[PDB]
Amino acid sequence: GVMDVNTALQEVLKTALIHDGLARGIREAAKALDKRQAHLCVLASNCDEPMYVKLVEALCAEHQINLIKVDDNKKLGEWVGLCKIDREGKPRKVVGCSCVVVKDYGKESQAKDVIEEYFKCKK
Amino acid sequence: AKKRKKKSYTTPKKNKHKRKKVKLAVLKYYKVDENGKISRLRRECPSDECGAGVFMASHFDRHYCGKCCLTYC
Amino acid sequence: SLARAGKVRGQTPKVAKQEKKKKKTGRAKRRMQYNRRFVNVVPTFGKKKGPNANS
Amino acid sequence: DEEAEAKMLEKYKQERLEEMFPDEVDTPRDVAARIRFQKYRGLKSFRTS
Amino acid sequence: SSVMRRNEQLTLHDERFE
Amino acid sequence: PRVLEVYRGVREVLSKYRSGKLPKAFKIIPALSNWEQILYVTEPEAWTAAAMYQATRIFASNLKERMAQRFYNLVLLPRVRDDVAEYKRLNFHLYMALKKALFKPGAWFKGILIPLCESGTCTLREAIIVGSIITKCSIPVLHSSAAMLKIAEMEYSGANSIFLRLLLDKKYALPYRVLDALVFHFLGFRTEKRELPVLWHQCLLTLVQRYKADLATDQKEALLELLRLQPHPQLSPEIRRELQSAVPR
Ligand SMILES: [Zn+2]
């Protein structure tokens, strides 16, 4: 319990970006999930359609996938990396993903640890 | 050097043909039950590479995958 | 029969004068005329280039 | 109020188009040119003809 | 790999050259 | 057998191609198992320019970045070099093919750009024609910088610095390690007795014109040492100007 729940996830996401293991969006979030190559699912609490949410929950229920629920999709735009940056490092493109599906992990000693702990507390 | 005038003339190319935007097509694939069971409406393609995830289109008579070009009756 | 008066004066496009910094005057100008000719001399094989020579 | 000021900028550009270019008028492609310049003739020389 | 580097402020992306 | 008669038929189609719907056997080439044997029957060297565009249009879309790269390297890139040497300007369809080849930037860089500069025999005219297509098509930041790093570490030629300038001309936010390679690239000519072209100075200009904000005092003064040893009457004062009016971080 060194790192936090809403801090260690960034590392997981960053490693996934590095190692080409991010199934973001809607169709890539779904079609890779049923292909049992995808391990985790992250969902936006801020939503327009509950049917989508239901579908997600079904997906998570079937292949025993752990569900993480983050407040807003617009916040997750910073977490995923769907922002175009300036020379200094300023975002000018504001697009936020509602579903972040994790395919691959980087072999981590802290993030993977904290996250594992969280998981084992949950289930 | 002797400069050219540059002529006006207005012809509208503003009207140009763009294909229709289909909004939120993911819900058409699956019907989720009240309990939480997933039911697939469309046929899933059993091809060499595009299996487990890639669906086939519902033609008026047949089925058609959109990656490998597989056709049926 | 023919004979316009000041044809070429009224046909020429009236180009506005560019704003440059003021020129030094008197002793200051003569100083600059001296240093541009006898102090920072650049070696040339035969000397065929002038002071105003544009290309 | 702004209609006359828009017309002034139209006149400013028309003056520039008739100082840089003598009297260059673009032919209309909609109406026939022999109809639009019905009453016009060509001179061999402006001075003599 | 060079000598004189980035020095100060921000590391947004790690980059994949491998 | 009979398949050899089908593709020997399409060999005579693609050699006289101009327009229209292609035979369906041609459109399924990257789906095959033994595709390189099939492609030799069709004779890519005897193809028309118009055919080459639609050939590239097939390979770019049908996935497999490794299969896409080897098509460009063996078929497409030699044909580009064949026509710049012959006609002195490039054919329209052949040009349009190269823009379509950028739908897979990984296979593009590893197949077209990097192999061209590594050969050394790349001329100035070859570089500008291909390099203009880089300016036209938007490229992903990760792939953009990855090609930029190789060219910076590469052996120096006149054709090489044209590409490097045009990648900086895109004006993306750069990874910090790439900047270290670019400084090390230019500082490699600090002791060089060789006369450097104007295109080299313009590349150094564009680097300082945009990325003056991401230069530390150590490398910033190392650049002023470079202009002091390798000068230019026109461009060197401008780079000197751009360094002196720079705000870091
Ligand atoms: Zn298909």
Burial bucket for residue F42 (CB in 10 Å: 0-12, 13-18, 19+)? buried
For residue D34, report the phi and psi dihedrals to the nearest 5 degrees. -80, -20
Q: Does the beta-carbon distance from F183 to E8 stay under 8 Å?
A: no
User: Which distant-in-sequence residues (6+ apart) come within 8 Å of B2 by Cβ?
Assistant: none
Nearest Cα to Cα of residue E16 among F7, B2, F17, F175: F175
- A85 contacts chain F (CB < 8 A): yes
- List % helix, strand, coil for chain F (3-state, nearest 5): 70, 0, 30
Nearest Cα to Cα of residue A23 among A41, A43, A47, A4: A41
For the record, the structure tokens of C9 come out as: 């004066």
According to DSSP, the residues that pair with D13 across neighbouring strands are none
What residues are neighbours of ligand 1 (ion), with CB under 5 Å? B 65-69
Q: Which long-range contacts (CB under 8 A, 24 or more apart) does B53-58 make?
A: B53/A30, B53/A31, B53/A32, B53/A34, B53/A35, B54/A31, B55/B29
User: Which distant-in-sequence residues (6+ apart) come within 8 Å of F120 by Cβ?
Assistant: F155, F157
For residue D43, report the phi and psi dihedrals to the nearest 5 degrees. -105, 135
Query: Cα separation of A76 and A60, whole Å?
Result: 19
Nearest chain C residue to D19 by CA distance is C13
Spacing, Cα B18 to ligand 1 middle (Å): 23
Neighbour count for residue F141 (Cβ, 10 Å)? 16
Which positions in chain C touch D19 (Cβ < 8 Å)?
Answer: 13
CA A54 to chain centroid, in Å, comes to 17
Task: Classify the C-alpha dihedral D33-D35-D37-D40 as positive or negative.
Answer: positive
According to DSSP, the residues that pair with F47 across neighbouring strands are none
Q: Are F29 and F11 in contact (CB under 8 A)?
A: no
| Side chain identity, residue A98 | S
CB interface of E with F, residues 1-18, below 8 Å = 1-9, 11-13, 15-17
Q: Are F72 and F104 in contact (CB under 8 A)?
A: no
Query: Cα separation of F249 and F233, whole Å?
Result: 30
According to DSSP, the residues that pair with A43 across neighbouring strands are A69, A99
Q: Which long-range contacts (CB under 8 A, 24 or more apart) does F148-155 make?
A: F148/F178, F148/F181, F148/F182, F149/E17, F149/F177, F149/F178, F149/F181, F150/F114, F151/F114, F151/F117, F152/F178, F152/F181, F152/F182, F152/F184, F152/F185, F153/F181, F153/F185, F154/F117, F154/F118, F155/F120
Angle between helix F236-244 and F198-210 (nearest 10): 10
Chains E and D touch (3+ CB pairs under 8 A): no
Greatest Cα pair distance, chain B, in angstroms, is 81
User: Which distant-in-sequence residues (6+ apart) come within 8 Å of D41 by Cβ?
Assistant: none
Domain A1-123: assigned CATH number = 3.30.1330.30
Subunits next to E (3 or more Cβ pairs <8 Å) are A, F
Which positions in chain F touch A86 (Cβ < 8 Å)?
Answer: 173
Nearest Cα to Cα of residue F183 among F155, F221, F240, F128: F221
Query: Domain spans of chain F?
Result: 1-249
For residue B71, report the phi and psi dihedrals to the nearest 5 degrees. -125, 145
Query: Cα separation of A59 and A52, whole Å?
Result: 11
Side-chain-side CA neighbours of residue F235 (13 Å): 18
Tell me C42's DSSP state.
Answer: P
Which positions in chain D touch B8 (Cβ < 8 Å)?
Answer: 26
For the record, the structure tokens of F22 come out as: 């292609």
Q: Report the residue count for chain D.
A: 49
Query: Cα separation of B11 and D22, whole Å?
Result: 27
Nearest Cα to Cα of residue B67 among B33, B42, B44: B44
- F249 contacts chain A (CB < 8 A): yes
Q: Are strands A67-70 and A40-44 parallel, antiparallel or unpaired?
A: parallel
Query: Cα separation of F216 and C12, whole Å?
Result: 53
Q: With the CA atoms of C38, C42, C48 and C50 taken in that order, what torsion angle do they form, in degrees rounded to the nearest 10? A: -50
For A74, the enclosing helix (H) or strand (E) is helix A73-80
For the record, the structure tokens of C30 come out as: 């003569």
User: Which distant-in-sequence residues (6+ apart) come within 8 Å of B21 by Cβ?
Assistant: none
Q: Does the beta-carbon distance from B5 to D24 stay under 8 Å?
A: yes
Of the candidates E4, E13, E17, the beta carbon closest to that of F222 is on: E4
Q: With the CA atoms of A85, A90, A95 and A98 taken in that order, what torsion angle do they form, in degrees rounded to the nearest 10? A: 100
- F247 contacts chain A (CB < 8 A): no
User: Which distant-in-sequence residues (6+ apart) come within 8 Å of A57 by Cβ?
Assistant: A67, B36
For residue F176, report the phi and psi dihedrals to the nearest 5 degrees. -75, -35
- E8 contacts chain A (CB < 8 A): no
- A49 contacts chain F (CB < 8 A): no
Nearest Cα to Cα of residue F47 among F87, F69, F1, F78: F78
User: Which distant-in-sequence residues (6+ apart) come within 8 Å of B19 by Cβ?
Assistant: none
Nearest Cα to Cα of residue F111 among F58, F144, F148, F72: F72
Tell me C18's DSSP state.
Answer: P
Q: Are A32 and A59 in contact (CB under 8 A)?
A: no
Spacing, Cα A87 to ligand 1 middle (Å): 42
User: Which distant-in-sequence residues (6+ apart) come within 8 Å of A72 by Cβ?
Assistant: A44, A45, A46, A96
Q: Are A21 and A29 in contact (CB under 8 A)?
A: no
For residue D11, report the phi and psi dihedrals to the nearest 5 degrees. -75, -35
For the record, the structure tokens of F206 come out as: 């564009």
Greatest Cα pair distance, chain E, in angstroms, is 25
Q: Does the beta-carbon distance from A85 to E10 stay under 8 Å?
A: no
Subunits next to F (3 or more Cβ pairs <8 Å) are A, E
Q: Does the beta-carbon distance from B32 to A54 stay under 8 Å?
A: yes
Which positions in chain A touch E16 (Cβ < 8 Å)?
Answer: 18
Spacing, Cα B21 to ligand 1 middle (Å): 21
CA–CA min distance E11, chain F (Å): 8
Q: Does the beta-carbon distance from B26 to A30 stay under 8 Å?
A: yes
How was this model experimentally determined?
A: cryo-EM
Which positions in chain D touch B7 (Cβ < 8 Å)?
Answer: 26
For the record, the structure tokens of F37 come out as: 């044997």
For the record, the structure tokens of F6 come out as: 């089908």
D2 three-state secondary structure: helix
Angle between helix A111-122 and A5-18 (nearest 10): 120
For the record, the structure tokens of F209 come out as: 């014109």
- B32 contacts chain A (CB < 8 A): yes
Nearest Cα to Cα of residue F234 among F194, F191, F205: F205
- Chain position carrying tokens 């600090």: F190
